[PDB]
Amino acid sequence: SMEQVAMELRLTELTRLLRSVLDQLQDKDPARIFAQPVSLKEVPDYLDHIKHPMDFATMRKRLEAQGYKNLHEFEEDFDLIIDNCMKYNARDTVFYRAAVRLRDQGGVVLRQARREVDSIG
């Protein structure tokens, strides 16, 4: 059907839009603190503290697998990155502060992304 292709044209172009967005958010973490998942061999109790671990490499796999069916899904993952860190790592750590800054710098990007999603459809 021509109808299913048109939704596939739409998901494809979304994934292209979100690929730009992700690249912008990852530019706001120049330390690459949120680049890969938190190793379990290096932090063995981590999963006792955090229930849904999340990172930029993991969000990228799901993207190229056209796994994000809206911006809300995409936002929830990014917030986990931030929120899981700000639970695990205390106030006076480079890790905590790295998510606080990312969150603040990411909200500019994610504001204009919401306007492009709606406008384009």
Curated annotation (Swiss-Prot):
Domain Bromo stretches: 9-113
Tissues expressing the protein: Highly expressed in testis.
Covalent cross-link Glycyl lysine isopeptide (Lys-Gly) (interchain with G-Cter in SUMO2), where: 41
Cell compartment(s), UniProt: Nucleus; Chromosome
Oligomeric and partner information: Component of some HBO1 complex composed of KAT7/HBO1, MEAF6, ING4 and BRD1/BRPF2. Component of the MOZ/MORF complex composed at least of ING5, KAT6A, KAT6B, MEAF6 and one of BRPF1, BRD1/BRPF2 and BRPF3. Interacts (via PHD-type zinc finger domain) with unmodified histone H3. Interacts (via PWWP domain) with dimethylated and trimethylated 'Lys-79' on histone H3.
Function: Scaffold subunit of various histone acetyltransferase (HAT) complexes, such as the MOZ/MORF and HBO1 complexes, that acts as a regulator of hematopoiesis. Plays a key role in HBO1 complex by directing KAT7/HBO1 specificity towards histone H3 'Lys-14' acetylation (H3K14ac), thereby promoting erythroid differentiation.
Official protein name in the record: Bromodomain-containing protein 1
Species, as recorded: Homo sapiens (Human)
Residues of the full protein shown: 555 to 674 of 1058
